[PDB]
Write a protein that binds this ligand. Structure first.
Ligand SMILES: NC(=O)c1ccc[n+]([C@@H]2O[C@H](COP(=O)([O-])OP(=O)(O)OC[C@H]3O[C@@H](n4cnc5c(N)ncnc54)[C@H](OP(=O)(O)O)[C@@H]3O)[C@@H](O)[C@H]2O)c1
Ligand SMILES: NC(=O)c1ccc[n+]([C@@H]2O[C@H](COP(=O)([O-])OP(=O)(O)OC[C@H]3O[C@@H](n4cnc5c(N)ncnc54)[C@H](OP(=O)(O)O)[C@@H]3O)[C@@H](O)[C@H]2O)c1
Ligand SMILES: NC(=O)c1ccc[n+]([C@@H]2O[C@H](COP(=O)([O-])OP(=O)(O)OC[C@H]3O[C@@H](n4cnc5c(N)ncnc54)[C@H](OP(=O)(O)O)[C@@H]3O)[C@@H](O)[C@H]2O)c1
Ligand SMILES: NC(=O)c1ccc[n+]([C@@H]2O[C@H](COP(=O)([O-])OP(=O)(O)OC[C@H]3O[C@@H](n4cnc5c(N)ncnc54)[C@H](OP(=O)(O)O)[C@@H]3O)[C@@H](O)[C@H]2O)c1
Ligand SMILES: CCCCCCc1ccc(Oc2ccccc2C)c(O)c1
Ligand SMILES: CCCCCCc1ccc(Oc2ccccc2C)c(O)c1
Ligand SMILES: CCCCCCc1ccc(Oc2ccccc2C)c(O)c1
Ligand SMILES: CCCCCCc1ccc(Oc2ccccc2C)c(O)c1
Ligand SMILES: N[C@@H](CCC(=O)O)C(=O)O
Ligand SMILES: N[C@@H](CCC(=O)O)C(=O)O
Lengths: 255, 254, 254, 255
């Protein structure tokens, strides 16, 4: 799994705790050229500071709000002109309003539901469509999901239905872009203390339950997600597509 | 037997709708039925279909599930007209034709979100509003297709919206369970319907089921309706967050 | 309504047996019933339980599913006594107590194969023999537990034997489907039975269904029986290779 | 990856076409010390020959018929006396009578059913129990499975039910050995022309269905199972246990 002369776009670093910073640390350490995309200017600033700890000899940062067709279209188009063709995309992007991450699911608003869908699932489809233009030779696209896409986990509410959508999106992209030699997979990460986690009702309780009940008796970290991301983005996984790998201490396997 | 029971059936379009299959079965079993339809020029059509049921009176309500107000005002009116209900059969989906063929990666945002809105989110709001009519509990059933568990060529955007619907069923089942409201899906094999003409490669799937499914035949709307009767009745007490395949066994094989 | 239907119910030991839950339901629905047992004591309990049912005749056959001879001869006798049947409810499993606690990695070969034989293989041979009494088609149902889909502390060797049973259902569905025989499983939530008294941590899992499952209560034998009636009747035509969870929704959550 | 100073035990090489031999080329290339176990004298002979193709400075071969408790016990015990502690085990062992891999599954005999369970599933339980003693600090155990374990595939008949069993066996083993830091996982390989495949009814008609229908539109090979084995056997996959990775061109994902 050595990746020199590989280029990967990582979407969704906000700070040093971001899962996508785990991927980045692991890919960068394996010698890959990286390009980063962000939404808030605070994320770019965090990216500028975190690039000091990476080996990247230059900073490729692109502002892409995935709610914008044109910002995605022109973002990847630009990445293509700056660095040429890419080997894959790590997609670490999701959003839901805080109302919608606690209390009663049946009370979700249309606007809150569609917002979570647009950012957390559909952004993958359009990223894939635009990213494919930079992978004339094939490549690898990995999204980040959560077990709550597969089962009804208390509080995760609108995001779980967005992750269900995301997971199917992976399969349909896998089928569609398969003949083009682009593999499309997901990582189902265990719960990890991140900026966005602070918004999920009951997140602390779940951390403690993994540690008590999951087979490895411990929580996972971002580097662990990065290690599997390296596998999925590299040749090591050449016959794997439409797959969902649980990086979660075995929790998905137990009841 | 379903005498003294009342269900709302959403999604009848013509003689061939899956929902009319459910209608015939529940009607036969003695339930009171209320029907919702999307557009006002399909009211007269619904009115003709009802001539074949033993419904003393025709309870029809226009609801486009794309509007909160229509869902909210619709279900309120149902409550004023008929009282508490025992359950809802949801049989509603939509996607634009150009997204049910060709390359899934080329789906527009508008088309992806439209499908989610109508085929998935509609269950949430319907469940919220229908709950108000079920103080002592009841049963809600949605219609899915196997393409929300696996990628099926051409089903495309609808497949992602069914994955979403099927999650929706589980989250509603978790939320609504303490209120004694069960939420399930039926996963129907392919059936010749008005909407099915819109899906690329449909006939080819009809043929495959016959060759490859364990029962070596296709299912019909009335078979979906018999499983609906079970899900909608006390017979399926204890069963919630479930997806039952009514598909000649196709889901189990590969 | 199951008048003029005949079902074989395998594996009642006492009034707490899941299959007696099945028995009462099909009995209420009008079916003729035939019971098979292994232990002398079970026959005795059956003779006495039959006073609670409307069966005017005791159809009691000793069939230890560890013996081919007994299964074959039993089903043949059953054919001679009552004729063709419409389905079989299989409610049989066994493992040693030592294999239902402490560490799965320590399971003996003998213990492992014992559980497979009795708890999984038994359905294949039953299906084969039962087939002969179903020239027209029928329905076969086996009873599984969620521990065959996920690792559940303590269920151990039985979880592997249930994973095997659930597969068995799928392959039997595939094989027998063109003969119009459906094969399905019911996955029951935990229920205080004689056998359950041997599973380590059974009480603890009982309580946490109450706490965590969508319906926040446990299920009972009669609720399994009502789904059995669904699966064993024409209501579930179209449905095969299926696994229906009668478990208050516990399967859908995490 | 990189696997110097790791030792892996590979069970079930018969000839050059064996899936486990793909595993073996990949771990060998990656620096690993390899120990091999076999049943038939022929398999040992093939192994001595195929060993010239590898970097292994030393042949470590052990006859273990997994139908024999004392052979598994004594084999692992002796492996540990010879090479010390190991980092994991690759299990590539299954068996059924031909009788039982065509025509009607309802006709399967008891003795053939139990035979397929014994070799194809139980063997893992005991292998893991014995392998554990050589992994005081933890390690990785991978077994090999097939989609016919998740779905009724025509003809795979009794082997499907033993794969269902093998796959639950992996989950129960993960929950149990997790606190010992031992991970347990499955590879679900697509159809690969091997000695044993020659005995499965209709195997060629599936090979061609994968090509026409699987997302990647091609079949996979023993080396692709190998490269996922290396991921699963290494620290790359820390946090993954109780998992089933489909290495099958995405066929598991479509209908
Ligand atoms: N931590 C966990 O337990 C957990 C578990 C499983 C999966 N995940 C998934 O992992 C991924 C990363 O989340 P995280 O936990 O690492 O949290 P995070 O560090 O807070 O990252 C979330 C990211 O989403 C980006 N984002 C949100 N909306 C966007 C938009 N419209 N356009 C572009 N970027 C947008 C944010 O960028 P800006 O800040 O610049 O807006 C941020 O970088 C998500 O898909 C999440 O669902 C998290
Ligand atoms: N037919 C199959 O092979 C198959 C298989 C599995 C699952 N399903 C599912 O079964 C359900 C019923 O489909 P069907 O095949 O019976 O098709 P159908 O007869 O054409 O019915 C679909 C219904 O959805 C309604 N609908 C569409 N948009 C709506 C909206 N915005 N508000 C309210 N109603 C709306 C349609 O109304 P209008 O006529 O007014 O447009 C129609 O009544 C769907 O959920 C479908 O996904 C179908
Ligand atoms: N109780 C639960 O929470 C639970 C949950 C999910 C699934 N299940 C399943 O439900 C089914 C019924 O079990 P249960 O809990 O109702 O327990 P039960 O009342 O103890 O029934 C078990 C039955 O298996 C029979 N049996 C065992 N080995 C046999 C053999 N070799 N030949 C013929 N019969 C044999 C027993 O007969 P004898 O007494 O005559 O030996 C007994 O009638 C089993 O599949 C069990 O795994 C139970
Ligand atoms: N090839 C495929 O398309 C395919 C696809 C998915 C999964 N698989 C799985 O892949 C694994 C490897 O099979 P393969 O295709 O590589 O075929 P293979 O080359 O024939 O290997 C099968 C191995 O099983 C060993 N074996 C059988 N019974 C044994 C016993 N009782 N004790 C010790 N070893 C025993 C054989 O050893 P001896 O020759 O010495 O008896 C042989 O090395 C199996 O688990 C199979 O189910 C194969
Ligand atoms: C009850 C659930 C407890 C564990 C949650 C794990 C988790 C934590 C963070 C996640 O990311 C987001 C969640 C909501 C909105 C935005 C993001 C990125 C996320 O997707 C999942
Ligand atoms: C790939 C071809 C096989 C799939 C046909 C099954 C099917 C048929 C009709 C369905 O209903 C709709 C489909 C598209 C748009 C709207 C509806 C209601 C539907 O959801 C599913
Ligand atoms: C970890 C505890 C989880 C509770 C499991 C519920 C249960 C109870 C009884 C069951 O039946 C048997 C179990 C072992 C042996 C024999 C039978 C019939 C059974 O199969 C399942
Ligand atoms: C209809 C089936 C289509 C192809 C199945 C692929 C396959 C091929 C060989 C396999 O290995 C065995 C099969 C039977 C007995 C023993 C082994 C090792 C095996 O386990 C799986
Ligand atoms: N967000 C709080 C709980 C919020 C609530 O009670 O809804 C937590 O992390 O526990
Ligand atoms: N299935 C066999 C031919 C006949 C049979 O096995 O029933 C094969 O293709 O090898």
């Amino acid at each position: 799994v050595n990746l020199e002369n590989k280029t990967y776009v990582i979407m969704g670093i906000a700070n040093k705790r971001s899962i996508a910073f785990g991927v980045a640390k692991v890919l960068d350490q394996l010698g890959a050229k990286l390009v980063f995309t962000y939404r808030k200017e605070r994320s770019r600033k965090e990216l500028e500071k975190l690039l000091e700890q990476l080996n990247q000899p230059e900073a490729h940062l692109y502002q892409i709000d995935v709610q914008s067709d044109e910002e995605v279209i022109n973002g990847f188009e630009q990445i293509g002109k700056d660095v040429g063709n890419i080997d894959g995309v790590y997609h670490s992007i999701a959003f839901a309003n805080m109302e919608d991450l606690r209390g009663r699911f049946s009370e979700t608003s249309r606007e809150g539901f569609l917002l979570a869908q647009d950012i957390s699932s559909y952004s993958l489809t359009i990223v894939a469509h635009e990213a494919k233009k930079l992978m004339p030779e094939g490549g690898s696209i990995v999204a980040t999901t959560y077990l709550g896409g597969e089962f009804a986990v208390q509080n995760y509410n609108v995001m779980g239905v967005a992750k269900a959508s995301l997971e199917a999106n992976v399969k349909y992209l896998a089928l569609d872009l398969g003949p083009d030699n682009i593999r499309v997979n997901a990582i189902s990460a265990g719960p990890i203390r991140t900026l966005s986690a602070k918004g999920v009702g009951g997140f602390n309780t779940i951390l403690k339950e993994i540690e008590e009940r999951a087979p490895l008796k411990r929580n996972v970290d971002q580097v662990e997600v990065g290690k599997t991301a390296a596998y999925l983005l590299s040749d090591l996984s050449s016959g794997v597509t439409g797959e969902n790998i649980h990086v979660d201490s075995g929790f998905h396997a137990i009841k």
